Design a protein around this nucleic acid. Structure first.
Ligand SMILES: [Mg+2]
Ligand SMILES: [Mg+2]
Ligand SMILES: [Mg+2]
Ligand SMILES: [Mg+2]
Ligand SMILES: [Mg+2]
Ligand SMILES: [Mg+2]
Ligand SMILES: [Mg+2]
Ligand SMILES: [Mg+2]
Ligand SMILES: [Mg+2]
Ligand SMILES: [Mg+2]
Ligand SMILES: [Mg+2]
Ligand SMILES: [Mg+2]
Ligand SMILES: [Mg+2]
Ligand SMILES: [Mg+2]
Ligand SMILES: [Mg+2]
Ligand SMILES: [Mg+2]
Ligand SMILES: [Mg+2]
Ligand SMILES: [Mg+2]
Lengths: 141, 56, 56, 61, 107, 63, 206, 141, 145, 69
RNA sequence: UUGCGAUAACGAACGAGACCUUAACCUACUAAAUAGUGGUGCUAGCAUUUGCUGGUUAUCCACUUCUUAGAGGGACUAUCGGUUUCAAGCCGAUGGAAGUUUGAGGCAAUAACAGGUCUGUGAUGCCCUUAGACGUUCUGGGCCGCACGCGCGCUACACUGACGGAGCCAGCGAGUCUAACCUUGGCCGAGAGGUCUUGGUAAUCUUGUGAAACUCCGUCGUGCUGGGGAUAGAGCAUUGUAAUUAUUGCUCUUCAACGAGGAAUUCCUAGUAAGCGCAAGUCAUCAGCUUGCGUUGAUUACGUCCCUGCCCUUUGUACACACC
């Protein structure tokens, strides 16, 4: 009966958790949205474009929850993909490191992640509580 | 060369070995190169016992 | 002396292979057959397998 | 692809010649007493010898 | 000078395993007769140094390659040793071909 | 078209120039032990059941 | 015949598959009785499976591929032409969608239809090159039942891959249209058209 | 303490360690239930140890599986092995042998890799090709 | 976070910025017909001009067209961040200009004949019709260019 | 060629003729009505909410839909 | 040429095989904070009433299943049928981790070729040059120069597909004070990258190399299209004494042919083909390359001499620098 955020599917959790912080609105979306692509390996900016930073922060805060520490550089390697170098074959290029650093500094000020002396960000007392509420909501909605 | 090779082949056999082979290649008063093996005894050419038993 | 074991073993394998060819050339007319290097603390000693030892 | 060399078949036939009122139609005891009655340099070599020898008894009966 | 545990570790690295596990056995046999408590020969994964070269010195022939392999085997034995009698019986008969390092720690 | 299912008795050997044709001996399921020899293009085996659109033709390619 | 409660709760539709193993959860492997024998032992029903993914070895002997199930053998003939090499997760996803569409139209059993396809577009008389040159003669041979299954899976899946290419229609539904047309015998499927081409050649190459 | 067995399952490089002990029906994979596995079309591989014998044989048992190595299909085939081997090893050490040999009958009569690790291994690549067998294209001209 | 409907108050093939921009295709992919305006540039200015991105470019109101083109002709006013343009630090006045439909050929000529006029080697290679970016001409381009 | 807007006379046979469709998909509306896939997708999500078609699969890249009752 | 058998031969040797390495098994031994698992010495969180966690090994204890690597065991086609001259063998079934030489390599005889390499060496004979040098070094250019013929490839022609979001999983390496290597973290920047620190001479840190194809949900909708990214313009960085003939990366723009390819031709029989990417090599910088490595994983045959190449026997020969 005590639900953690592992009993809920990751697609259904992050969609529910993104729409929570969107409808709550304290995440300080940094200003350079709609000019940025989220990776050099990307062709386009995010296709939803009113959003996608609530979704990126919901996936980061879930990723902090699952793991024990994640930093910015681990986060770029996470969200990178295949870069089309045109006529040369593809490669892994790490994602945008100013987007993910401004995700993490955003989740700090709303109390989800903190400074974690073994590296980057661990999920907080309150942040674990916040995701666990939404996980309880998502199974029975 | 025939006195040198059979000198050292039959020194090896009289010093107690299972096999010996001397191969001399080059030119000796003739322009065209030739090779001749001076083999007496018993050799094994294939496998690990080349590494176990053979000094080359 | 702050060097990796992949590097320190290869460098000692190179110090062996250098003295093998050096003592091949310098001790050619004294029946050198091999060198054996023993890596001990506070001294390394170089063992020379020379058949006619008495002029080495 | 499972034809046996003369060195398996000579040593098998040389075992049958002088150890018939010994080793039987079981491979496992034939494997184990070729450790004592023969000096075979490898475990893979011993098992091929002991297996053809086992095959030989089943033909002899 | 009086029977105090020093928390020493002897790491043993060597290319050839039979001469390596000879000394790693003798370190076990020495510390099983002074009744010293030890974490035994911990067998680290074998370092395999592979070098791939073309067979030919020039550039002729089929494209044929060697893999020349050096295997590095390594062990360490942890000890808690009365130092003066154990350093007496370890510095003697150092094995060629096996590299041995002795490290003490303050833990 | 009056087809007939036939039951393989013996695989008589490979034929054809490349070996891809296997010649077999079959007996018919209806009116059994009426036994003839046919050619087969695919992998045929003992006791396979295969179908003939003719009842009077024996295989002629061999060796 | 009961629902069971566990500390990690199992849904009821999968709990109903405890009583019978079906394709993915939906279509039984029973009553898939084959009206044409000589392909039984070569169409692999009578061993139910859940999903059409199995990492089974069936190509190490001569006839082990007759024991791979006929839905796995259909998925196998999809994931090719290079860009789809590997990717059985995509090919299993197609057949899940395909057997839906086969169930929607002509509402009978979708496993029975793909079995009715294999027994209908198996080439019963083929031809071979007798004579080892380009100027040669062609001879009418009978066809092995394993080959009739082997070619039928190839003919249906090529006709799916061609028809789904360069149009709005999906590989899920072109194959579904391929198998439904082949189940009836209609001459509007690629595989029936290619089969009768093989058989009219062998009427004349006797 | 508790009646506990620990088994493993193995595809090519994916090794799923199962810690099967007495409990209340719990079936968990790396922190998460058996209901959410990803790939969600290969969900019924990790339901075949459950459905071939029935769920009632898992009702007294907690299964906590960690899988690492391999890939997405390859880890799935180690999950279904780790818990089909975990249940049988629990029916060896604790429950009867006749009840163990019904488990090993219906597991093996469906899928032999449920209990026995497949020995297909990556054959090494050879020089003169990109593949183990396949060779570079040769010219003659 | 949901899906909404639409209706077709629709207008066909439409001149815009000296280009017959098409109807029946969406807004940031109808404006890629205009030279100098590609996909990233269409997508940024159809968000800066408060245009719904699913509008199919012919349900677009004629004042929504005018805000689209006013942003294109003048981007540094409207917070396009000056790394997003074709011509930056231009060649002669140092100011960032996004060059548009008939002018991108015009500034291309102005680049190529600036470069020949100093007899620079890339202009010479541009005059001769060879590749100018350090290629290997020995094998490639051997039915044209 | 394919109607990417939805005027009324296509709308009144979307709502009249997707009844008597056994199978409905994105491409089924493209090749038998004459709209594009981006309006066939909209005509799928709208028509299940009206309940004249009922979902079976609802996968992205492949939707299987069928007539209610 | 592996044997069986026939036998004027009998009994052997080198080569094949055996051998060595690697991969697959070991809930049997030897263990380990440089690998894990289980409690909890001991905590401390979130939802709760036990599920998911995070933390300390003289600020715990225990175990080795998982991993490692010592020493061993295992498979010998075992057993049973079918066929064979009841041989040697082969096939099927059952068992088994494995029944294709268990998979795959390393080694590999006798004889050679006018095979290549004097431009790998302080391997070397002979010849050429030796100061106005063919030595060495310095500055700049060239190998990349482009009507074109050919070879190996890389990117595609798209809906089994591109994009965006989300899920998110390997294995083989390498790495610095015998000095600037692999780089975590924080901060600044769309990005490239910059700066302040850190860990690591490495089962310890980079690194769970959170790799790519893949999966799901959206956007596209058969349009050379949002496929393809060639060419080309403008700006910002990195390496380097030096980037021009763009070193490479980055952001915008330009958006070529290409609608699956005549004649012909290459590779390939199971974790193999193929799709996918990662490490290493050269490396200051540069991979469409190679050597490996893992992810995903099919079709088709278990045959034949039809084509090609090779081998053996018979026949022919006026050939033995041996049809050059
Ligand atoms: Mg960093
Ligand atoms: Mg690029
Ligand atoms: Mg001899
Ligand atoms: Mg031998
Ligand atoms: Mg051998
Ligand atoms: Mg034949
Ligand atoms: Mg390959
Ligand atoms: Mg173990
Ligand atoms: Mg020569
Ligand atoms: Mg020559
Ligand atoms: Mg000089
Ligand atoms: Mg060159
Ligand atoms: Mg070439
Ligand atoms: Mg994608
Ligand atoms: Mg790993
Ligand atoms: Mg285009
Ligand atoms: Mg260069
Ligand atoms: Mg490199």
């Amino acid at each position: 009966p005590g639900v953690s955020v592992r009993d809920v599917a990751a697609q259904d959790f992050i969609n529910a958790y993104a729409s929570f912080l969107q409808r709550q609105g304290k995440l300080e979306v940094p200003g350079y949205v709609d000019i940025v692509k989220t990776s050099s390996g990307n062709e386009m900016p995010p296709q939803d474009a009113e959003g996608w930073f609530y979704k990126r922060a919901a996936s980061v805060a879930r990723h902090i929850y699952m793991r024990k520490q994640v930093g910015v550089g681990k986060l770029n390697k996470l969200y990178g993909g295949a870069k089309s170098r045109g006529v040369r074959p593809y490669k892994h290029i790490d994602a945008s490191g100013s987007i993910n650093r401004k995700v993490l500094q955003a989740l700090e000020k709303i109390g989800i992640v903190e400074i974690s002396p073994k590296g980057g960000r661990r999920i907080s007392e309150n942040g674990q509580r916040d995701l666990d509420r939404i996980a309880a909501q998502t199974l029975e909605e | 060369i025939r006195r040198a090779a059979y000198g050292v082949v039959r020194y090896v056999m009289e010093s107690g070995a299972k096999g010996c082979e001397v191969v001399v290649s080059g030119k000796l008063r003739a322009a065209r190169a030739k090779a001749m093996k001076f083999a007496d005894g018993f050799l094994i050419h294939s496998g690990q016992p080349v590494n176990d038993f053979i000094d080359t | 002396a702050l060097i990796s074991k992949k590097r320190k073993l290869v460098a000692d394998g190179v110090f062996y292979a250098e003295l093998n060819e050096f003592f091949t050339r310098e001790l050619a007319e004294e029946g050198y057959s091999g060198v054996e290097v023993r890596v001990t603390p506070t001294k390394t000693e170089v063992i020379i397998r020379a058949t006619r030892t008495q002029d080495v | 692809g499972r034809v046996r060399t003369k060195t398996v078949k000579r040593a098998s036939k040389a075992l049958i010649e002088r150890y018939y009122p010994k080793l039987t139609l079981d491979f496992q005891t034939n494997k184990r007493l070729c450790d004592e009655i023969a000096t075979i340099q490898s475990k893979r070599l011993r098992n091929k010898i002991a297996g053809y020898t086992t095959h030989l008894m089943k033909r002899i009966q | 000078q009086q029977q105090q545990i020093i928390k020493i570790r002897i790491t043993l690295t060597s290319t050839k395993v039979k001469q390596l596990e000879n000394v790693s056995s003798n370190i076990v046999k020495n510390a099983e007769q002074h009744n010293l408590v030890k974490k035994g020969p911990v067998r680290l994964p074998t370092k395999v140094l592979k070098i791939s070269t073309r067979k030919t010195p020039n550039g002729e022939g089929s494209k044929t390659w060697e893999t020349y392999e050096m295997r590095i085997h390594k062990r360490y034995i942890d000890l808690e040793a009365p130092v003066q009698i154990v350093k007496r019986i370890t510095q003697i008969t150092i094995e060629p071909g096996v590299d041995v390092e002795v490290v003490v720690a303050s833990n | 078209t009056p087809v007939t299912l036939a039951k393989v008795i013996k695989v008589l050997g490979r034929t054809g120039s490349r070996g891809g044709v296997t010649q077999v001996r079959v007996e018919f399921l209806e009116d059994t032990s009426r036994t003839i020899v046919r050619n087969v293009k695919g992998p045929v085996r003992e006791n396979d059941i295969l179908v003939l659109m003719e009842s009077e033709r024996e295989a002629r390619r061999l060796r | 015949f009961t629902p069971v409660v566990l500390a990690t709760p199992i849904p009821e539709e999968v709990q109903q598959a405890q009583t019978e193993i079906k394709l993915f959860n939906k279509w039984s492997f029973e009553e898939v009785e084959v009206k044409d024998a000589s392909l039984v032992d070569y169409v692999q029903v009578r061993q139910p499976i859940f999903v059409a993914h199995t990492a089974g070895r069936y190509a190490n002997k001569r006839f082990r591929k007759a024991q791979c199930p006929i839905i796995e053998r259909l998925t196998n003939s999809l994931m090719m032409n290079g860009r789809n090499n590997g990717k059985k997760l995509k090919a299993v996803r197609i057949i899940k969608h395909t057997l839906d569409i086969i169930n929607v139209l002509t509402d009978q059993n979708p496993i029975q239809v793909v079995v009715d396809a294999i027994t209908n577009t198996g080439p019963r008389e083929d031809t071979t090159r007798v004579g080892g040159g380009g100027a040669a003669r062609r001879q009418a041979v009978d066809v092995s039942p394993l080959r009739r299954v082997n070619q039928a899976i190839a003919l249906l899946t090529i006709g799916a891959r061609e028809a789904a290419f360069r149009n709005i229609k999906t590989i899920a539904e072109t194959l579904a249209e391929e198998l439904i047309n082949a189940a009836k015998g209609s001459s509007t499927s690629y595989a029936i058209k290619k089969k009768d081409e093989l058989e009219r050649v062998a009427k004349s190459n006797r | 303490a508790v009646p506990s067995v620990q088994t493993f399952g193995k595809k090519k490089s994916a090794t799923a360690v199962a810690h099967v002990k007495a409990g209340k029906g719990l079936i968990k994979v790396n922190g998460s239930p058996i209901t959410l596995v990803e790939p969600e079309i290969l969900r019924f591989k990790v339901y075949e140890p459950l459905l071939l014998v029935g769920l009632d044989k898992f009702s007294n048992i907690d299964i906590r599986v960690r899988v690492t190595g391999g890939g997405h299909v390859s880890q799935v085939y180690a999950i279904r092995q780790a818990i089909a081997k975990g249940l049988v090893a629990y029916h060896q050490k604790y429950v009867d042998e006749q009840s163990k040999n019904e488990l090993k009958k219906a597991f093996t009569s469906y899928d032999r890799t449920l209990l026995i690790a497949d020995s297909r291994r990556p054959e090494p690549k050879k020089f003169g090709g990109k593949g183990a067998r396949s060779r570079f294209q040769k010219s003659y001209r | 976070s949901l899906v909404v409907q639409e209706q077709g108050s629709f207008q066909h093939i439409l001149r815009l910025l000296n280009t017959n921009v098409d109807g029946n295709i969406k807004i940031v992919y109808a404006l890629t017909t205009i030279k100098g305006v590609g996909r990233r540039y269409s997508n940024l200015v159809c968000k800066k001009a408060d245009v719904d991105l699913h509008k199919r470019a012919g349900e677009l109101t004629q004042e929504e067209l005018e805000r689209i083109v006013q942003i294109m002709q003048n981007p540094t006013h409207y917070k396009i961040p000056a790394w997003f343009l074709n011509r930056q630090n231009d060649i002669t006045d140092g100011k960032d200009y996004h060059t548009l439909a008939n002018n991108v050929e015009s500034k291309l000529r102005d680049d190529l004949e600036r470069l020949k006029k100093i007899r620079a080697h890339r202009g010479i290679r541009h005059f001769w019709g060879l590749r100018v970016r350090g290629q290997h001409t020995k094998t490639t381009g051997r039915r044209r260019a | 060629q394919h109607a990417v807007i939805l005027d009324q006379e296509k709308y009144d046979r979307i709502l009249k003729e997707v009844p008597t469709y056994r199978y409905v998909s994105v491409s089924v509306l493209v090749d038998r009505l004459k709209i594009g896939g981006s309006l066939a997708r909209i005509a799928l999500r709208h028509l299940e909410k009206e309940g004249i078609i009922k979902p079976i699969s609802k996968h992205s890249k492949q939707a299987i839909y069928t007539r209610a009752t």
